[PDB]
Structures are given as structure tokens and as C-alpha cells.
């Protein structure tokens, strides 16, 4: 039970935590880059859209940029962030 904390790769064990400010689950990280949990992964991890954290394994990652100031991630226009699919460990 040792977790990655940045530069996340497929196969990494990660801690998925609730981020109230961004109203989403994210990967716990020491980097300022946000790694949001992809909404598709919530059922697999027995989470809902609360459990404060769960351990998971990264399955897929996609790099995104906010094109609108009003967005589901509550990030500024132009923010680059990741969406990560994960499964329970």
C-alpha cells in the first residue's frame, strides 16, 4: 500500500479524495496540476456525484483544457487538467 503522488501512470495505485472546492473527486497529489476522477469511474469505486477517500488504480488518463469559464470542474478558463478513469483496489 504505497501510492503515487504525481506524474500518474496507468497501473499506479492512487488515493482518490473528495475536493470540495472543485466539487469533484481528484487524485491526491503534490503537483498543482489537477487530476480529476472521470465521472464514468464513480460506480466502479462505489462513489456518488460522502466517502472522503478511496484507493484505486489508474486505468486511463486524458489531458484536457477548459474552454469555458463556467465548467463542471470549477477551474478558470484555460486551465489544463487531466481526467482519469480508475478502478477499485
Amino acid at each position: 500500500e504505497k501510492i503515487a503522488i504525481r506524474d500518474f501512470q496507468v497501473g499506479d495505485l492512487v488515493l482518490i479524495i473528495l475536493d470540495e472546492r472543485h466539487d469533484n473527486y481528484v487524485l491526491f497529489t503534490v503537483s498543482p496540476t489537477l487530476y480529476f476522477l472521470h465521472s464514468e469511474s464513480l460506480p466502479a469505486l462505489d462513489l456518488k456525484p460522502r466517502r472522503p477517500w478511496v484507493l484505486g488504480k489508474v486505468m486511463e488518463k486524458e489531458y484536457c483544457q477548459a474552454k469555458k469559464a463556467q465548467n463542471r470542474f470549477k477551474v478558470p478558463l484555460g486551465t489544463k487538467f487531466y481526467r482519469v478513469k480508475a478502478v477499485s483496489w
Binding site: 489531458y63 484536457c64 477548459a66 474552454k67 469555458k68 463556467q70 465548467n71 463542471r72 470542474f73
Partner: peptide, 6 residues
């Protein structure tokens, strides 16, 4: 259209 893959 809120975000796009880069």
C-alpha cells in the same frame, strides 16, 4: 463544449 482534449 466545456473542455476539449489537448
Amino acid at each position: 463544449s466545456e473542455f476539449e482534449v489537448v
